[PDB]
Design a protein around this ligand. Structure first.
Ligand SMILES: [Ca+2]
Ligand SMILES: [Ca+2]
Ligand SMILES: [Ca+2]
Ligand SMILES: [Ca+2]
Lengths: 7, 290, 290, 7
């Protein structure tokens, strides 16, 4: 439902 | 096979002289994983744990399909003892936490939360994260909170979603949480990166433009993002901890090391919303003695 | 006006220049009490509670039968007009908590804890203590821990049992608790004062010898001891809390303000056991712009 | 009993 990616 | 100009710019060699190279510090690396056989890293890694989907959720498989995770690793603590490259804390130890699966390099919050909770139960000194997420989820905040009250220094890239205007803000999580040591990126002329997130929760900035570190399969390469700034701070924390536990003759608490971290910072003239306390510069107090 | 030697030396006026004089900071002075009608202090106080036995527990009577509380309260925030002297933070407000009775300036850990919690209850920004006792009573660490939990800055003089010798530790509480910002004492020339306790929990030092500030009945006078050094720090965080909160454009937390305390510190060539991070020197990161 | 003096 909630996502992160590198940056 | 020396010291990425980036790592000399933050003044880490001048701390190696005094014998502060990271020894005794464990740093959990919450990223896309890490190729654990890379020569510049093999004896730096102490453990590896998968929380993403890749490899049928084989938890011991941490293979880095993206590159960034090994790249982050090398910047923190790559050793030259195999004729390779150096990190900011080359006598410190990495724990590899794979919370981003697939090659485009993206993981689910519960995986990030899994690795944060893990990292603390393993009692690392430093959690290093180079990820961002656009939403503030309360389970995330609490995990961040729990780790910090546990004594862990929680470092995160601040967010790439920035535009250049210090009047307009962008919020990346977990960086945006007050507890995190949110790290923005600068030019190597130290100007604020155009993509550096601005908000009121930037702590400091590090080099994040065109950074040389290790890539999987005994290779190297440059990259870009606040994902490159953060490992400069992460590694640097480990040698600050070394310098200060010696000077104070005891172990230093989480807030103390933070004070010590922003004490090793020279300020910039740009706004605190872009640069935080300033540029990570580990010889700043000496500069005060002159 | 002729602001004291020591206050110029800690560079306070150079922050008065910027408008940082204490506006909105509230400091609870736990001490012998105070003569609340001294011209340089009558305005600056917002209330007073006494937990001693003097006046028979008449809690509204905080009058100073020793002279130190008034001297301390004067060093934090005495006012320029009505003649007289300038505190470190003349635009801030003081709360007179009287936990030390009689002329010998003694009180029980009951009355100290009471007042600490009373200042916490009243939601003040800083607790300045210049007391000290050899027993380590968990309930006292309790009170301070709860107060820092809520986000108070807890300042305390380091103790007057030093013997010049950094290889020998002397412990005074509450200074000795890690959570407490322990303040040791130097001289005109920033030399460690022989009586300043030495241990692994000194955070910084301030002028503690021959400090002239307000004495009861429109009088002044000089005193010596770590009790003179802590109020320099207490009034400083007022100024500092105002400075950094502008620069960041938000309210800072207790670990952030602490970091900003240590940043405005000056490295000293003496053991951390005696001087901690060094000398309270409020322009110190401007000295870094060079 | 604790007790503590000004310092
Ligand atoms: Ca921006
Ligand atoms: Ca922060
Ligand atoms: Ca001594
Ligand atoms: Ca402290």
């Amino acid at each position: 439902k909630g996502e992160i990616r590198l940056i």
